[PDB]
Amino acid sequence: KFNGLTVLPPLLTDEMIAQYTSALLAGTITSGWTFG
Amino acid sequence: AEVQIDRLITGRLQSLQTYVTQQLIRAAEIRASANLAATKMSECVLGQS
Amino acid sequence: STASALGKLQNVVNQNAQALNTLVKQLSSNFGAISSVLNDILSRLDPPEAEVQIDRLITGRLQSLQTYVTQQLIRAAEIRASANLAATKMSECVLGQS
Amino acid sequence: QTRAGCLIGAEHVNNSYECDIPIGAGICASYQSI
Amino acid sequence: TKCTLKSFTVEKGIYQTSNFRVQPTESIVRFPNITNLCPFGEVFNATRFASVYAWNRKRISNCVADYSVLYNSASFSTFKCYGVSPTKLNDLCFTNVYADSFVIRGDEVRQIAPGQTGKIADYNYKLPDDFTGCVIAWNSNNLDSKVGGNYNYRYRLFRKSNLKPFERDISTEIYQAGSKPCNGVEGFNCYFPLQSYGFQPTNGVGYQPYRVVVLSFELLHAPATVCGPKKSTNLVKNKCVNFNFNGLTGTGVLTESNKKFLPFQQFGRDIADTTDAVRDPQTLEILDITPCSFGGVSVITPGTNTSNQVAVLYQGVNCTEVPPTWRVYSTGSNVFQTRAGCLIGAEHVNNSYECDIPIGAGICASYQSI
Amino acid sequence: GLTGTGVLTESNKKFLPFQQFGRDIADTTDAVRDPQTLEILDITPCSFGG
Amino acid sequence: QCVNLRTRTQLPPAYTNSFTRGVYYPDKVFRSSVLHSTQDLFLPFFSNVTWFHNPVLPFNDGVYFASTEKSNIIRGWIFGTTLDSKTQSLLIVNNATNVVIKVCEFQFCNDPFLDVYESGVYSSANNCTFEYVSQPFLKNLREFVFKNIDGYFKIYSKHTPINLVRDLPQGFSALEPLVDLPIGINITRFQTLLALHRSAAAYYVGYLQPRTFLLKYNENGTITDAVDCALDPLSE
Amino acid sequence: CGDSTECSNLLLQYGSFCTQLNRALTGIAVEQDKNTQEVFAQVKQIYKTPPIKDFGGFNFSQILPDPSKPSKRSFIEDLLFNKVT
Amino acid sequence: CGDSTECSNLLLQYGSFCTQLNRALTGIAVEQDKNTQEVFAQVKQIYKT
Ligand SMILES: *[C@@H]1O[C@H](CO)[C@@H](O[C@@H]2O[C@H](CO)[C@@H](O)[C@H](O)[C@H]2NC(C)=O)[C@H](O)[C@H]1NC(C)=O
Ligand SMILES: *[C@@H]1O[C@H](CO)[C@@H](O[C@@H]2O[C@H](CO)[C@@H](O)[C@H](O)[C@H]2NC(C)=O)[C@H](O)[C@H]1NC(C)=O
Ligand SMILES: *[C@@H]1O[C@H](CO)[C@@H](O[C@@H]2O[C@H](CO)[C@@H](O)[C@H](O)[C@H]2NC(C)=O)[C@H](O)[C@H]1NC(C)=O
Ligand SMILES: *[C@@H]1O[C@H](CO)[C@@H](O[C@@H]2O[C@H](CO)[C@@H](O)[C@H](O)[C@H]2NC(C)=O)[C@H](O)[C@H]1NC(C)=O
Ligand SMILES: *[C@@H]1O[C@H](CO)[C@@H](O[C@@H]2O[C@H](CO)[C@@H](O)[C@H](O)[C@H]2NC(C)=O)[C@H](O)[C@H]1NC(C)=O
Ligand SMILES: *[C@@H]1O[C@H](CO)[C@@H](O[C@@H]2O[C@H](CO)[C@@H](O)[C@H](O)[C@H]2NC(C)=O)[C@H](O)[C@H]1NC(C)=O
Ligand SMILES: *[C@@H]1O[C@H](CO)[C@@H](O[C@@H]2O[C@H](CO)[C@@H](O)[C@H](O)[C@H]2NC(C)=O)[C@H](O)[C@H]1NC(C)=O
């Protein structure tokens, strides 16, 4: 926000990405490939 | 003053257009990479390849 | 029953139509001249300034045309990528089991 | 007040569920009032 | 094809060469019935001219104006027009013409110009930057100069600020240059803003009284009423023709329109300043204008390495009208009409099979004859 | 004679005795010294946005 | 025949809502089935409009005038700066026959009326320039828009059959151009004219401001809908 | 320029931009045609379904072509062509 | 223009470059969001170890 230009935040924060990654990891560890 | 402002205006407009075109090219390349990443996620994490 | 299930094709059509529309509408701009019509600006002035006015109009319209062509090139490349993917899907998931 | 700026005309709730209109920074809005 | 491809040999394929466009025939001129001599003598041959600070203004409308009768005369020292070339003034129609008349000194004629600064340019007479029209100046030492001194001409010298364009100031109030308010009484740093001239026949150039008149026009704000001396003609329909409707010039075919203009409507456009309707000044008939046919042309050849016969395709053009002259392919050669356009020089058969050079819409051509 | 628009604040940047003002990148005058009080101030633009 | 009234009747200066009235054709060009955006002087939507049930009112940039009149008691208008013979004044009257438009330095009095039994208040009509005669302007809702721009007096009019009781109705009706006058004056104030019987009138007044509008032209070329651009965000 | 000799004379001193623009557009069009051709023409012959249809109880009526309509399209294709404008 | 009225008036006659520039940038931003969402949101439920 200096000379007419702005940067917009992303829709998904880092916590949501971490939650998605954790869910994928737990699913593949426990259920094999069936959950897909 | 109109002449001077015209010169400044055309220069800055050209610079802006150059920036936008470069951004478009880079975005297309990043989209291709993201599609490849999504395919790898689908095929190698959710199953054996 | 449910509509709006074909957003991609409609989006392509809308983008093309909008680009053509703005290209046509750009023809009415002034670009710093005294008018935006060739005939009136020609039927009113001694040529020595007519060249100035036509130069302004010419450069403006040339920039507009170049911008349109570049945007079209980008969209064409993206469409080609999509259709390559479609051809691969048709070959693999229709003529055999994947 | 959100990380994307300031929002006027929307009732903030503590319930959470899948949304349709994105806003940003994990905040999004929908129409039940808004 | 060889010329546009920059080679002496061409291989089998289809190449797009150029464009064609129907040539317009004859011309149409349409001006209103009204006709009467425009009273230029009264404003030009006026016995008395007003002062510069009280320049005389007149509005001229509903007349037939001839400007050649003013260009030919050399009685004017300066004849300088700004937005229009003088020689074309007899070919345009305006409305609400404005004429202003006044008298100044010899050296002040330069001040009557847009984007100018000085004494008159900011304190007596101000012109807009984008002013269109003309300015006329001539010598008036033999009539407006007196041996006893000319004092009927006064100019505004002191004012609070500069004047707006086309602004007339007539107020004569004492001017307070200093900090002490004059309070309506002349005193120190108090001066009369109106100063009289010293026109004398003894004085040489640069001091003789000169008479200046300026003419101002409009550009397409309403149905014009001040036309030049041009003879009208009849009108034709269903032919690609050049037309000049009351100064609006163009080319195309004219058709009896059916859209209902309201009584205050003059012409019509739909998108992006495309005048597609008009009402003729005399008959008061609504017509619509559409451009006559044009389009691209391409060729089909089996490669100059094999033969020299070619076929010609006009893209998106009806077969009824075709005759770049090339009348040879217009007499009795085989002609075909396809969704892509019209094809000349090829023989249409009922046999269908996998094909050479494509054309469009499921039609394609090949060399057996073509 | 240097004209601009923004909000003024008490700058803490230490100017050398011969210094007049300051800038960081691409001709952005973000500091000033008033001719009378000889005080160092920093300027930042007032808020804007979509 | 100059005289001053002694009853001193006071018209109540009420306020009411503009709603969506005061839309006119901006130019003479023809369009059909299209949306056009234009920037010009209009009457903002949902604005206070003053209701009188004859003070001198300012003219400002332009004036929207409306009357749900019965039996055309309202006759004419006066425009000027001081409304005396010192300065140029504009007079418009509309009697049973053709209208009269004059641009002269009359000497008006404080209580002008038609003197029912053209000698209302003017008695020192001096040298002047413009005169004009044309067709008459007039449970009838009569709406007028008066503008003074570029030394030009533009008058737009519209007449509708009104069946509502008191105030302006909800609806849309474009104002067609009526007349243009090529005269340059310094109008600042104006006043109405009543043909009071000799042998308590209702009208609404509003002011114009510059803004941007979006207009919809149907197939026949008639303006049928409009949207204000500087309003609640949805409009923008 | 739009039918103006003076405009064309002034323009021709700007080089050969228009040749490049036309070449680019022509390349795009040819690419589109080749693109659809390679997507859809995956076969060499035109197979025909038998007149008698007993596919073990499976019902393919709504995706097979309909000879009744002149378009020779199926139900789903006709539904598709009416929802894209 | 940097908040100058004369610059705005002069620029007004150049057409509608700004609308399409902003349109292109908004398209890029939407594409970025879609890329992330498509790559990572591969599951319907949030499993726990
Ligand atoms: C003002 O009067 C002069 C009179 O000399 C006009 O000049 C002559 O006009 C007649 C008109 O038919 C011409 O035939 C002559 O050739 C003109 N010149 C001379 C020397 O007689 C002049 O035209 C008048 N001004 C205007 C505006 O008409
Ligand atoms: C080429 O032009 C002819 C005549 O201009 C077209 O024939 C017209 O077709 C319309 C629509 O069927 C009829 O209403 C007219 O009466 C026809 N005119 C004549 C003189 O027969 C012909 O259709 C055009 N070519 C194409 C491919 O449309
Ligand atoms: C139009 O008339 C008004 C008044 O009728 C003029 O305003 C006056 O201007 C003078 C000079 O600046 C002042 O001394 C007066 O006090 C003003 N009076 C009012 C009531 O404002 C205005 O200048 C005129 N406009 C013109 C002639 O263009
Ligand atoms: C009514 O207004 C008219 C304006 O036209 C006044 O002028 C008369 O107009 C009629 C046209 O119908 C002419 O025949 C008369 O000669 C005009 N003059 C007079 C003195 O009548 C008219 O005076 C006004 N008053 C009446 C009672 O008609
Ligand atoms: C006709 O118009 C002229 C133009 O101004 C008037 O002339 C002056 O009017 C003022 C008005 O107060 C007088 O003070 C001057 O003495 C007039 N000068 C001359 C030379 O007449 C004139 O008054 C107007 N005629 C009438 C009858 O009003
Ligand atoms: C637009 O103009 C058309 C043609 O004048 C109008 O259609 C007519 O309407 C009247 C009134 O109902 C009917 O009596 C005619 O038979 C109609 N003519 C036709 C349909 O050709 C139409 O009403 C006008 N207004 C709109 C909004 O279309
Ligand atoms: C396959 O499904 C279609 C429906 O999609 C069946 O056609 C229906 O047949 C019944 C029996 O006469 C009719 O009442 C329906 O109107 C038909 N539907 C349509 C859309 O026409 C068809 O019979 C099924 N195939 C078999 C072998 O029974």
Ligand SMILES: *[C@@H]1O[C@H](CO)[C@@H](O)[C@H](O)[C@H]1NC(C)=O
């Ligand atoms: C949730 O937010 C609301 C605000 O609407 C607040 O009143 C409440 O205390 C918060 N916590 C819970 C557990 O509801």
Ligand SMILES: *[C@@H]1O[C@H](CO)[C@@H](O)[C@H](O)[C@H]1NC(C)=O
């Ligand atoms: C113009 O004049 C001609 C012949 O004088 C006449 O036939 C035509 O009707 C006139 N146009 C009008 C009156 O609009």
Ligand SMILES: *[C@@H]1O[C@H](CO)[C@@H](O)[C@H](O)[C@H]1NC(C)=O
């Ligand atoms: C056409 O080309 C073929 C092979 O390129 C060649 O054999 C033949 O002679 C050519 N025809 C000519 C040169 O007339």
Ligand SMILES: *[C@@H]1O[C@H](CO)[C@@H](O)[C@H](O)[C@H]1NC(C)=O
């Ligand atoms: C064969 O072609 C000719 C012209 O190419 C055509 O007139 C004729 O009708 C065609 N034959 C049949 C059976 O349609």
Ligand SMILES: *[C@@H]1O[C@H](CO)[C@@H](O)[C@H](O)[C@H]1NC(C)=O
């Ligand atoms: C400038 O002059 C004023 C008035 O005499 C004084 O107050 C101020 O201290 C002076 N500034 C400097 C830097 O001396």
Ligand SMILES: *[C@@H]1O[C@H](CO)[C@@H](O)[C@H](O)[C@H]1NC(C)=O
């Ligand atoms: C009109 O004026 C009244 C009081 O004069 C005010 O209460 C009302 O809000 C106004 N209407 C508007 C501003 O739309």
